[PDB]
Design a protein around this nucleic acid. Structure first.
Ligand SMILES: *C(=O)c1cnc2ccccc2n1
Ligand SMILES: *C(=O)c1cnc2ccccc2n1
Ligand SMILES: *C(=O)c1cnc2ccccc2n1
Ligand SMILES: *C(=O)c1cnc2ccccc2n1
Ligand SMILES: [Mg+2]
Ligand SMILES: [Mg+2]
Ligand SMILES: [Mn+2]
Lengths: 8, 8
DNA sequence: ACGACGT
DNA sequence: ACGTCGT
């Protein structure tokens, strides 16, 4: 849920 | 019902 | 009744 | 280095 690199 | 990973 | 990620 | 959900 975080998007720091993916942002699922 | 939400789809944040599944979206049922 | 439903599970996922990459720069 | 980063965590989330409601019909
Ligand atoms: C988002 O909050 C979150 C938490 N855990 C995960 C695990 C695997 C893929 C994506 C994810 N996203
Ligand atoms: C984004 O591509 C990515 C990959 N690995 C991680 C590890 C820990 C926190 C965030 C990350 N983001
Ligand atoms: C969607 O709103 C919702 C709420 N609760 C659930 C529980 C189990 C599976 C799917 C669900 N979807
Ligand atoms: C999606 O794959 C997934 C898995 N676990 C969760 C927990 C809480 C909110 C959203 C979620 N999404
Ligand atoms: Mg990875
Ligand atoms: Mg709920
Ligand atoms: Mn986590």
């Amino acid at each position: 849920x975080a998007x720091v690199x993916a942002x699922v």
